[PDB]
Amino acid sequence: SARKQNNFSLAMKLLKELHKESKTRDDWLVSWVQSYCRLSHCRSRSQGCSEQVLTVLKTVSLLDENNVSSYLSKNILAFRDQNILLGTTYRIIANALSSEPACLAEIEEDKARRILELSEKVIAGLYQRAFQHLSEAVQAAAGVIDAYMTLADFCDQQLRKEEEQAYPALVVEKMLKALKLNSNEARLKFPRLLQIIERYPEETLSLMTKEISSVPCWQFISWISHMVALLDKDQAVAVQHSVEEITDNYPQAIVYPFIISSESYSFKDTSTGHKNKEFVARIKSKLDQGGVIQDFINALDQLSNPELLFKDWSNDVRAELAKTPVNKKNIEKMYERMYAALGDPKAPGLGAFRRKFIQTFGKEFDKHFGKGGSKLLRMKLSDFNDITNMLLLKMNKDSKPPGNLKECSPWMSDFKVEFLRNELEIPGQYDGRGKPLPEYHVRIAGFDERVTVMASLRRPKRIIIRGHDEREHPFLVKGGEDLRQDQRVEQLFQVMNGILAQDSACSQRALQLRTYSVVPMTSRLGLIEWLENTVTLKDLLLNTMSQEEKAAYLSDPRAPPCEYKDWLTKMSGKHDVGAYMLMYKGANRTETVTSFRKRESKVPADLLKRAFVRMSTSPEAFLALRSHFASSHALICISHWILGIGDRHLNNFMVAMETGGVIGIDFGHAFGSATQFLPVPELMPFRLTRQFINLMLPMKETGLMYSIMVHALRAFRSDPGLLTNTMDVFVKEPSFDWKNFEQKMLKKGGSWIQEINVAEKNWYPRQKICYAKRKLAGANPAVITCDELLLGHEKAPAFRDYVAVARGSKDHNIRAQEPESGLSEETQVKCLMDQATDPNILGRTWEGWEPWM
């Protein structure tokens, strides 16, 4: 327990006094020495390179002492554990030696000759010794999976070194055998096998096809979206039986991934290309056999507004016809896909699903298609696509609020619970991690009549659909948005808080990210759970202000917004977006900080404190509200900095007014992209402004937001691997690229209007992982931000000014006083906080980010 809780030197103090009473009787000295080895490894984990060896040669001197002539001689359990321990010690020494330039030979010659038993030659010998010891261990529930996983990750990290042998033949089988019983760590490490297969198509293919059949089926649902997209391309024979039997056993965790993968499909003209076509046809035929999932998706499609759908269509055509002058036989097929459920006034029939508004849309916009069908369908010339925006204006002028009745979708409204029909099985379940029980999963037995529309620049609708469990499950249907990235970041947060719940430092504080289920049934149509009793942070700040204060904030051009705009346009001379380009060089640190402080001194300081004290009615529960708010916000801030998540404006943050916890949404920039592909880069690692500092104003910010961030960062960086492997899987996913990045950017407006072609090479889906590993293994956040600016804002005339303002001044801004790498957790988080609260950075950020509040 002491070793588990990181409370070191207490296990040492007790083991020193327990050493004598361990060799008098057998079957105890082996356990004593193995615990000593585990303690030494754990202590060496959190130490420097020079001291890492000095604390592991001592144990190996003691571990080799008290030799095999004991209970260890033959019970093939102590032997296996000891082999694992020797392998771990040797690999630790090898990693410590190799990480440095091998200039660690400043220790006394005694240790030099002690480690010289078996330059690069000794390193290779140590690696070989570790490999042999691990092989000996694996040659022999719990206690056996450990050796399998140890050898597997050893081989994986050895192979990863070559990216910048017989290991692939080993690791695949050695980890599939472990996963066969139960292994969540290998479950999260599964797509590394896919990367191995892509790297070594000539080996282990038949090995997997023979081995993957033995594994239980339900351990694959958590990664089914990778396999379904995999079988589209080559190497589909690697795993095809598992998909077939999983769509046989559980034909509900496959339908949506299959639909999204089959929306964009590919094949080959060879025998292999001709192969798997019958397979995918058979899978699609055995699925949707009742034709009810497609009916549900079509019914939900009518719920989405048509105005923003046509806006997305206009963006798509104005991008394709412009950037692809030689595009052929694409505009007509997209024209019919758009006609499928939106175009014709005579939709009744195949179109169907009367809405009284889409049919009203089939009453004014209908047959306004001369321009359209009569010309672009025949000559197919681009002509001018900007002569269609007044059409959108015309349909927007009649943007009546729908949803007064559910009769806007007849299938939705009269969805009686019909008898045996291959029932719907409401999306969101099938999370993996255990035996699924589809008989216990809830199913929808009726949709609520009342439907309300939110306000998020897309106007998503809220449905209050019921369930067969006699419960009411609210949901928020999102139309026209690809939710695959949201699913990926939610899985990332799941593994993140799983890591967070595996250390006494963070588990004692009950540190846990709050996640909401996200499930996209198809492209441009997904469901995100609508959490109950939550208030957006911006609304919580606004509504708690006095009426006069709110009026003076939204008007009276002395308020921070208009004053900031006037300051920018006066310092730069431009009244348009992008004036920051010349505004950055237009001021020094002193003028910027003085102006920022003057502008920030307008909004009330204790607005958050007033909001928290206005819904407590007790000095005894207000403290327990503020504490929870601060703790959760700090945790999500450090977690967001671990990834590249940016664009943390007020509307994204939601605070659960019931209990004070904070949640984040709208992960539109999964990895570092808020500081690269924008007119104005976001230089703050996270959000920490005056309303967060003054929430505990009589008590400096280094009190509660500091220890929480330190503990979370230590928990993340002390156990790399699972998190790093998951991020590497996500970045290399082929649905995450600049084919949908620009799509979701044009889904919004104003920020990063997409007109570029050379930058498509500037995506670099290989440096994101390098930067994440650097900032996770210890790196100055200023250095990381400067590197991101260098990558994304190359040959920019203001790039030098950007790096200068993101670096520091050596008189303040502690974030530039430390080595560029090898930082400790406390110093790293201090640099994070200083960058977040630097007035210079906040004073020259995007206006919409609202830096003042």
Side-chain angles (χ1 to χ4, degrees), residues 179-234:
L179 166 63
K180 211 217 292 309
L181 313 94
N182 252 338
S183 167
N184 43 6
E185 62 295 10
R187 184 182 328 130
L188 315 148
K189 278 171 185 164
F190 174 84
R192 194 55 181 87
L193 293 188
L194 277 274
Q195 268 166 217
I196 275 177
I197 293 316
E198 195 268 347
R199 190 44 62 110
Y200 317 113
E202 69 215 46
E203 204 174 341
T204 70
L205 266 287
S206 47
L207 202 47
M208 155 157 27
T209 65
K210 190 64 61 215
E211 192 90 25
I212 213 166
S213 322
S214 82
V215 75
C217 69
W218 42 273
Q219 300 264 66
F220 279 162
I221 46 189
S222 99
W223 301 101
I224 178 154
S225 192
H226 302 277
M227 330 181 170
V228 182
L230 159 79
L231 54 94
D232 183 32
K233 66 154 299 294
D234 282 337

Side-chain angles (χ1 to χ4, degrees), residues 311 313-323 385-386 746:
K311 185 63 221 73
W313 174 95
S314 63
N315 282 333
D316 206 344
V317 293
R318 83 164 282 101
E320 172 85 340
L321 302 157
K323 86 161 49 62
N385 198 246
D386 283 298
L746 301 203

Side-chain angles (χ1 to χ4, degrees), residues 283-328:
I283 297 286
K284 202 209 169 167
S285 315
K286 69 183 307 181
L287 275 188
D288 190 72
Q289 82 302 359
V292 73
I293 306 304
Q294 199 58 43
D295 286 3
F296 178 50
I297 292 183
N298 283 130
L300 271 190
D301 214 279
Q302 291 328 329
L303 217 57
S304 64
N305 226 26
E307 316 198 344
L308 85 161
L309 283 172
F310 208 101
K311 185 63 221 73
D312 299 359
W313 174 95
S314 63
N315 282 333
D316 206 344
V317 293
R318 83 164 282 101
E320 172 85 340
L321 302 157
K323 86 161 49 62
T324 59
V326 292
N327 176 42
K328 307 191 185 173

Side-chain angles (χ1 to χ4, degrees), residues 221-222 250-253 425 428-432 436-438 441:
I221 46 189
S222 99
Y250 311 128
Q252 295 294 311
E425 184 85 343
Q429 281 97 315
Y430 296 130
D431 65 306
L437 319 90
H441 294 353

Side-chain angles (χ1 to χ4, degrees), residues 725-740:
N725 289 337
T726 315
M727 311 165 48
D728 187 279
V729 166
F730 163 57
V731 53
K732 276 164 194 157
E733 174 156 55
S735 34
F736 154 70
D737 207 337
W738 212 330
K739 274 177 216 40
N740 42 288

